[PDB]
């Protein structure tokens, strides 16, 4: 229950940060940060500046107030993600954002001017609604994999990157699939640089896999890797449902030995 659109909210942090930084080009560090992490840098870097008011020069009291109505904003989305929002955060915390190697000057917001639309794109997570996410990863199997056949309407797929390489700077964090109820296609496009759906086409890709995200009424395909083998039991699927409120998965029975 966001009492307010994620597009205004993010509309009213950009100009803000704009009318402090006045156009340095921003360095990064090589570690990535979840979103909390994210928030808390610039949270702590607000506060930090008012602090440096130093001498109550009008012009500085404006730079003052122009920092705690973006402090507020910043705090209340962070304050909006901790809560309720554990069925989603806990995916939430898969993004990567990233941070600031130095966070002292004004000149400095160009970082969090650049990471804006990534962090747009995650504030629409529990607002852009319409299914439902399943708060859990599908069922690991000890020697076996998965893979859906049929993405549905509204499942994603994180911009994660190869080893050394960063999803590109100010781009978004994943992609989405558009059912509506014509068509059926993607939207988004991930971008790496260096230091009833269909599956989307790679880009200099993650060397590792995929970090999905499947709404409601989803299934994955198991099976086991090469030099393992099967004996079925029960069920080589599951599926994510939503049994009173909570979503899970329907626990699916198959094993590989070597």
């Known amino acids: 229950n966001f009492h307010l659109r994620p597009r205004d909210l993010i509309s009213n942090i950009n100009v803000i940060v704009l009318e402090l930084k006045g ?14 992490e994210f928030l808390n840098r610039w949270i702590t870097f607000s506060q930090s500046i008012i602090s440096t008011l130093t001498g109550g020069s009008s012009s500085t009291k404006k730079t003052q107030l122009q920092l705690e109505h973006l402090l507020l904003d910043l705090q209340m989305i962070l304050n909006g993600i901790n809560n309720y929002k554990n069925p989603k955060l806990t995916r939430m915390l898969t993004f990567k954002f990233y941070m600031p190697k130095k966070a002292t000057e004004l000149k400095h917001l160009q970082c969090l001017e650049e990471e804006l639309k990534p962090l747009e794109e995650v504030l629409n997570l529990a607002q852009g609604s319409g299914s439902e996410l399943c708060d859990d990863d ?121």
């Open 23 to 36: 156009t340095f080009m921003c360095e990064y560090a090589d570690e990535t940060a979840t979103i909390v």
């Open 138 to 258: 599908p069922p690991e199997i000890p020697h076996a994999t998965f893979k859906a056949m049929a993405y549905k309407e509204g499942t994603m797929l994180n911009c994660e990157c190869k080893r050394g390489f960063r999803r590109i700077k100010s781009g978004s964090l994943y992609m989405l699939c558009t059912g509506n109820s014509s068509h059926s296609s993607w939207d988004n496009q991930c971008q790496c640089t260096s230091s009833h759906c269909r599956e989307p086409p790679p880009w200099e890709n993650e060397a590792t896999e995929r970090i999905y995200h499947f709404v409601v009424g989803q299934m994955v395909y198991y099976q086991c890797v090469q030099g393992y083998r099967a004996l079925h039991r029960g069920p080589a699927e599951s599926v994510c449902k939503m049994t009173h409120g909570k979503t899970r998965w329907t626990q699916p029975q198959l094993i590989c030995t070597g």
